[PDB]
Amino acid sequence: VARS
Amino acid sequence: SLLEFGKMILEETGKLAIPSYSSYGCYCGWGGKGTPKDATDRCCFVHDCCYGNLPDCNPKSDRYKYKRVNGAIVCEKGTSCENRICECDKAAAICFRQNLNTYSKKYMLYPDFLCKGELKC
- The DSSP code sequence of B84-121 is HHHHHHHHHHHHHHHTGGG--GGGBT--GGG--S----
User: By residue range, what is the domain housing residue B50?
Assistant: 1-121
Does the annotation mark B41 as catalytic?
A: no
Task: Identify which of B46, B40, B53 has the alpha carbon closest to the alpha carbon of residue B97.
Answer: B40
Count of residues for chain B?
121
Are the C-beta atoms of residues B24 and B40 closer than 8 Å to each other?
Answer: yes
Within 10 Å of residue B8's Cβ, how many Cβ atoms? Answer: 20
Q: How far is B53 from chain A (nearest CA, A)?
A: 11
Q: Rounded CA gap, B76 and B83, in Å?
A: 7
Output the DSSP codes for B23-81.
TBTTTTTT--SS--SSHHHHHHHHHHHHHHT-TTS-TTT----EEEETTEEEEPP--HH
Q: Rounded CA gap, B64 and B81, in Å?
A: 9
Which CATH number is B83's domain given? 1.20.90.10
Q: How far is A2 from chain B (nearest CA, A)?
A: 6
Count of residues for chain A?
4
Overall resolution, Å: 1.2
DSSP type of residue B97: H
Within 10 Å of residue B116's Cβ, how many Cβ atoms? Answer: 10
Q: With an 8 Å Cβ cutoff, are B44 and A1 in contact?
A: no
| Domains held by chain B: number | 1
Are the C-beta atoms of residues B29 and B5 closer than 8 Å to each other?
Answer: no
DSSP type of residue B109: T
